[PDB]
Amino acid sequence: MRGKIYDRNGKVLAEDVERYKLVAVIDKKASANSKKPRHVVDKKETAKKLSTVINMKPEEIEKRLSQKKAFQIEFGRKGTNLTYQDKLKIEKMNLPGISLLPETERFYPNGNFASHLIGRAQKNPDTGELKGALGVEKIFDSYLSGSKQPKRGDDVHLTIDSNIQVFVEEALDGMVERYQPKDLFAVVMDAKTGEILAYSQRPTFNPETGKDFGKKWANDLYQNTYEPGSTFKSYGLAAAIQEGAFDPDKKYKSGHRDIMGSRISDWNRVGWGEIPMSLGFTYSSNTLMMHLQDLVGADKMKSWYERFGFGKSTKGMFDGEAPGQIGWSNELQQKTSSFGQSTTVTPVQMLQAQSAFFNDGNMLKPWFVNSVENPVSKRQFYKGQKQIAGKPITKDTAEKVEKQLDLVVNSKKSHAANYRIDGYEVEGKTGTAQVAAPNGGGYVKGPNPYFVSFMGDAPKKNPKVIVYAGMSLAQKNDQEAYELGVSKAFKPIMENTLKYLNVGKSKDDT
């Protein structure tokens, strides 16, 4: 038998099952040396009875039964992967020539569910051997397979919680209705451990059926790189707070900056003139970040972006984890980086970084694989745990960074109040950002050709969970997309997750 993939609560995510395949002996030759016929006789009346129990027409059942120079015929997709009672029905019909051959099939109970994390195993018709093709299934193929007495494979426990992973798969569906984006992902992560509690992307595939398997081969969380947008200012701001370049009450000149003769300007183009650094961040002033880069100095800001573990794989347990790159080739790359362009990141790299603001400066290496253990021997081949990827900042720094994130959402001047939730205090940072042109080019163009993100955590200050949500190139409501961003996904995902984790406020959301 092949191993099982379990959730954190040992709920099954993938297992082997015995299913059945229809076969009809059409040629007389089977019953020359037999009392009972071993071949189909009333090809019309056997075709009739087989209908209803099979999802084929009594017309096409005969069509496949009246093939010639053929001893033993089958029925494509439609008469394979059949259930145990599906068999007991056809078996009771005591039809001659008709047999049911038991084939073992990999079964994904919730179907399209963390499809890009869990992955999928494909079966070799000849040996019936199952081989992992993506995600957990391919990563651990050796451990799951019992080929690498008939011996049983090893189980693999994920940190996924089916109950959260639900809220996520639902909200993500709601976004492909509203915005039909080219790419989309959410992830929930325990603030205090780096456990991935839920993760899905769009487009994905259904591992049960095999629908749309291929297409997007790449896992968003671990394999796809992004120009992240302003979610990434948070790390610049930390660095500055540490170096002492930032002070919430100190003023700076907003508007634009001329860098290698280019007018990179705040999102209103004009600025708000001389204002406090706090408001600048609350507003998402790109000039602020460029000002702080100047104050701290290019060389130190690369060292800082490296110290937050960018342009270097998080070393998580996924196949070809991407490292991304820090945009620091010339002074423009460097300034554009400050507000999350040029530089490419894995969303996981971001989870790592953001963790440092709640773990008193320490970045938590994110992990989704809890254990690999043969359920016979009980021998933990591998066991996951919370490690520390680095401590780039001090507790002080982190506390200050958090206050600014509180304001981004909960300031009187918040431009991100659409990310608020009834019955819970939320904080985080917003990230509207242009998208790189796939093959050569430069930037995808359009009316709102953006990747909107949010990197929130609740409850604010001492949070339980971080939710990172990203939507690429909304091909519908592309305006609402720019305006509301991933607020339409974040609010449900968080709200339900906090209820499910039993956190309280003023009503106890009964």
Describe what this molecule looks like in 3D:
The chain is α+β, with helices and mostly antiparallel strands and 510 residues long. 29% of the residues lie in helices and 20% in strands. It has two domains: 13-106, Alpha-Beta Plaits (2-Layer Sandwich); 162-501, DD-peptidase/beta-lactamase superfamily (Beta-lactamase, 3-Layer(aba) Sandwich), CATH 3.40.710. The strands form six sheets. Strands 1, 2, 3, 4, 7, 15 and 16 form a seven-stranded mixed sheet that branches. Strand 15 (369-373) and strand 16 form a beta hairpin. Helix 10 (277-283) packs across helix 15. One of its GO terms (cellular component) is plasma membrane. Belongs to the transpeptidase family. Keywords: Membrane, Transmembrane, Transmembrane helix.
Keywords:
alpha+beta; Beta-lactamase; 2 domains; seven-stranded mixed β-sheet; five-stranded antiparallel β-sheet; 20 strands; transmembrane helix; transmembrane; penicillin binding
